[PDB]
Amino acid sequence: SGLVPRGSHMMEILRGSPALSAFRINKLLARFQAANLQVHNIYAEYVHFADLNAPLNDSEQAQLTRLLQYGPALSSHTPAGKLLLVTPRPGTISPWSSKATDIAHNCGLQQVDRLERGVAYYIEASTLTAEQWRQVAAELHDRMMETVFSSLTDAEKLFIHHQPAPVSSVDLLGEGRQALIDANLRLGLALAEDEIDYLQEAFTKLGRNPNDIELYMFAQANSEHCRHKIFNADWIIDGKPQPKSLFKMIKNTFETTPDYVLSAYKDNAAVMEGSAVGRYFADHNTGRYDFHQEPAHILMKVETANHPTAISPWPGAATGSGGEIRDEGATGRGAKPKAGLVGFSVSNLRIPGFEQPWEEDFGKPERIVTALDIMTEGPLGGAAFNNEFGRPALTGYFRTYEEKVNSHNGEELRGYHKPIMLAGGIGNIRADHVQKGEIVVGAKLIVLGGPAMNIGLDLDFASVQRDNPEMERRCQEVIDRCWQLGDANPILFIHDVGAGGLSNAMPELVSDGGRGGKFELRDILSDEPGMSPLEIWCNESQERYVLAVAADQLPLFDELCKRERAPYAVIGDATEEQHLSLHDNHFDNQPIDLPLDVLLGKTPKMTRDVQTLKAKGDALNRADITIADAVKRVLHLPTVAEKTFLVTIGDRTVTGMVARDQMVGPWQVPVADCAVTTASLDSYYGEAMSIGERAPVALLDFAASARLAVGEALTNIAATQIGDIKRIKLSANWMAAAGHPGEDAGLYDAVKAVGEELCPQLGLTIPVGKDSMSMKTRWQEGNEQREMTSPLSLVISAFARVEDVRHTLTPQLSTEDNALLLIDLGKGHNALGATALAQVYRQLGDKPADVRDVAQLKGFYDAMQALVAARKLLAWHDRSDGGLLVTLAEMAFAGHCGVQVDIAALGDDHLAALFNEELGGVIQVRAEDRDAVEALLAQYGLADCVHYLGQALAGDRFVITANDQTVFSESRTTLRVWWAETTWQMQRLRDNPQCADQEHEAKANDTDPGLNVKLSFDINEDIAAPYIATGARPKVAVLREQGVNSHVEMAAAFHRAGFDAIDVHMSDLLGGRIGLGNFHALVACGGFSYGDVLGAGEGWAKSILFNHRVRDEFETFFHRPQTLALGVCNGCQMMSNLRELIPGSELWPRFVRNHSDRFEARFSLVEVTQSPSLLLQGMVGSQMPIAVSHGEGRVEVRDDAHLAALESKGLVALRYVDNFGKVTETYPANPNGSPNGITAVTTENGRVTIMMPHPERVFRTVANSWHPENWGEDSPWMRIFRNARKQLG
Ligand SMILES: Nc1ncnc2c1ncn2[C@@H]1O[C@H](COP(=O)(O)OP(=O)(O)O)[C@@H](O)[C@H]1O
Ligand SMILES: [Mg+2]
Ligand SMILES: [Mg+2]
Ligand SMILES: [Mg+2]
């Protein structure tokens, strides 16, 4: 390896492995050909750069070299052709770097100051000009994050030490107002004239020049983003002063319905009442996991990341989720995220070779990415955060819209060039932590989390975000430790770090407590020593929280952080005086010195004096429309179409509390209308999340669009067992182009429509929300000015306590004798304006849907709740995009059956009856219950809306009649494949196209029987019960490393089998607080230890191997004659890297990147095979589904000799099977490409078993996405843990 001087350090260059699989190489070559770049071949290798602060001895050097060996064993090639090295841009540090460096440090290599990675491309193209070489280089890197170099040694530029930049004053005293004008422009403060006035007067009064940092801080605190001027403005509309702000109209819903609300408008989440259940976690003193019976109340929040996602969509969406997760954990005095939701709105995809007939290219700003790039990289970013942090993503929306329409301001381009990127979720919180505590004078003021870097301050580099989810998981564990101390929780006050960085968050924190603060700049953790005080204080670096703790709790807080490996710094003290001081020990000066009332003082309230514009719609021109062609087009609208590309990329099982995910039934079809989690691992109480949104309707009727968003949230949630509608609480997220003609009045009318009218009438609170007020994009296209302006876009998220998660209905049709009933809350209006139908024929139409009758909407909800509780429904699916046609089609997909329905009672206009998007939906009931159900509906005033349609039938026919006429008839399989083509095409361009194609094609085989089970044992027989009945409970070491996230449910699985589950962190073993000699059983848990950097599980394993003491400890345990060990997912990966310590493991494979090249969150069919594994005794020959959630689960052997030997030794314990029951390598039945379906192996003695899937996530029947109806509480997988208990005796 290379090793050269690098300032006061030395940089080593270490060659890595091949970086690109053959499909990615072929895609690059095909792109060069399409651009007329004659490239003969391309080969890529990873290259690692280690900046060292002191030398490595031979043993250390071998360790570093070994740390940097990871990844799929693709064949090396001797470099040939022109080198183009792609790295992060100078002045940035990749998250890869942060994590790789942490691993080196935890392996004892303190001489490593920083590791960084690039990709060396070797391009053979003898014919190319210097300009064409620049186009080659452009294809190989992301201009917003990366640079291209011509030498490996050029990477020294990434590690240049810069001296701290000093504070700069702005010379108000020496130049007058012009100094502020100049600084406003130079620093991009975006200050209004009255803010310049305010600043001039404040600093004139103080008799000194403002520092840049003080002006920047002020400017971020007074931005529209941060201060919500529009939502607090006075209004005049059509010449009449209005009596309430938009914010006051939202709060009206709380004044009317305070019921069940614990916290609203006083934190960065709302809180509502949950249920008393067993909160499961490890005691501070014992380290033992136990149930704590108490209220688990429910917090909720929804954020957006719309501007950053237009610029750099991966980190935009990633930090959209990451920032919202911090909002959750900083609720109260600390709380715990539980599940997420995700939303996207973008312009037309225009997928190459799959262009749809409504799509027209209208151009876009050069500086933003395309709609397709947002939907490619954005979902991956959001999922990278949710997967690596560890929260399941269980509901969402995805809308495409881009059209030239005759809307409120006449004919113009309306769409989402600036996208909606929405991220939200629910969490749980203890009752005594909901209220923020007092900040005592003298409280210590702390930053918990990541380093600062210069983030948030080519073209828009300031909008390129950066995510490190594992850092935030580390912080969440500290927060967890704190709230888990109950009355001894040392957090007095916590707040997330977001917009404005420390410059907003710390002043907010002290101000919220009625205190001031004094801070020391040089106590803040920084990874960029060149940064100015402005950059340090104001940057928008991620994964940070601020909190206040009493001085006497610092030793406790320090112990908590050190055990989790969460960085923290004490950076100031709360003061009685309401002043803000920031001192700098390096420069011996005071960058900030301000009264808080100056700093947080307000310019006057805004007044918006505006006028109504109302579009007259145009009647839908039906010339080119037929029912058959409409069905085909609508199924091809991404808004309607199957969403799998957004769903399987994100974990849906972490925590073991997910009851209802998006995928429904044996055929795992993503049509669930809402998410449901259990409240704990010991209850059937739970929580539900749904979304309603209908932006295109706002192009015709602003208030109708907002009413439908509320209505649809309710219809999506309605077949979940909740009870009182007042239990349902809403987030309202308002996206608008404020100032665009007609939008401001429209916004006011829409907020009034829901806040003053519909939600109070229904009994719905809106206790949380946000606004994003610049939803438009302008650019120069020809000679012409162009603009793309969003509709007003309200997104409602609904959240509710659930009474019994077991009673949730889905769209999965039964074929027992049945009746299908439409509940048409449209009352026969059958509107077609602003529908999917209209959109797919390039039109807006005339009049949209709306809430037609408030009492009947409420009646619908209550009738559904009565039917759910009485168990009278077989299925439910609501009507939304694509109308009744799509509702029925999606039900037939989920039921893998046909329908025979007649629509003669829905009007003479069959098109309008089928494609209107009025509220309501289809219930399925048992035929014998039809009359009673209809009487029930009639009791709620719905008789007029209720219509018998027909029945679900076995087979493949989707038939719509009207008397004796066939209106539409098609193969259900044909429809289901058309509906899949969008996700097919997205998967195909994003992932391994062979996998995309296999997944797509399997949908066309109607004989697929779906997931099905065969059991070799009695699922209900607790073989551990006689042991448990003795009260003797063996310990299990529940092993976790930093970034592990699946340890709680693992503990709970062993607990149910009779173990005392002990939390054992790798820090515990390294510090002597735990020794494995005291245990007879050990389990290595799932997650993303070190973010999987350096190969999943490798940093964890090598941290053990390279500490001789801990290594010996593991080796001793494994060589004992009676010990048992299990490794699941990340723990399986980890243990596969410890073969040298594990007897009988010599034939084990490696686990590497899935063949799909994508994270796979699947509910996959496996079979238990004959092997020595003691943990699978009694289960051989069983077939049943299991939770899969991994990106590096593919079994990789050295050669066929190794595969054959492993197989002949008989050590394979689980294999993927297809639904026909055969061992398979076809995707996604086998989700990762593992040869012979292998996904678990054991040792020769059967005492150690490792597996990729997660039995601990699905030990509870209620947590199985699909399962046989007759199962009880226990799934088949409970047997693994019971086997471990019995084996111990
Ligand atoms: N952006 C997304 N991320 C994750 N899941 C999503 C996303 N968009 C849609 N889904 C899910 O895919 C399924 C279909 O979504 P959609 O047809 O928009 O729902 P609906 O029409 O019931 O409102 C639902 O289970 C939904 O939660
Ligand atoms: Mg839908
Ligand atoms: Mg729905
Ligand atoms: Mg929807």
From Swiss-Prot:
InterPro entries: Class_I_gatase-like (IPR029062), FGAR-AT_N (IPR040707), FGAR-AT_PurM_N-like (IPR055181), PurL_large (IPR010073), PurL_linker (IPR041609), PurM-like_C_dom (IPR010918), PurM-like_C_sf (IPR036676), PurM-like_N_sf (IPR036921)
Binding-site residues, Mg(2+): 673, 712, 716, 878
GO CC aspect terms: cytoplasm
Domain Glutamine amidotransferase type-1: 1036-1289
SMART domains referenced in this protein's UniProt entry, alphabetically: GATase_5
NCBIfam families: FGAM_synt, PRK05297.1
Record-stated family: In the N-terminal section; belongs to the FGAMS family.
Subunit structure comment from the entry: Monomer.
Protein name per the record: Phosphoribosylformylglycinamidine synthase
Originating organism: Salmonella typhimurium (strain LT2 / SGSC1412 / ATCC 700720)
Gene assigned in the entry: purL
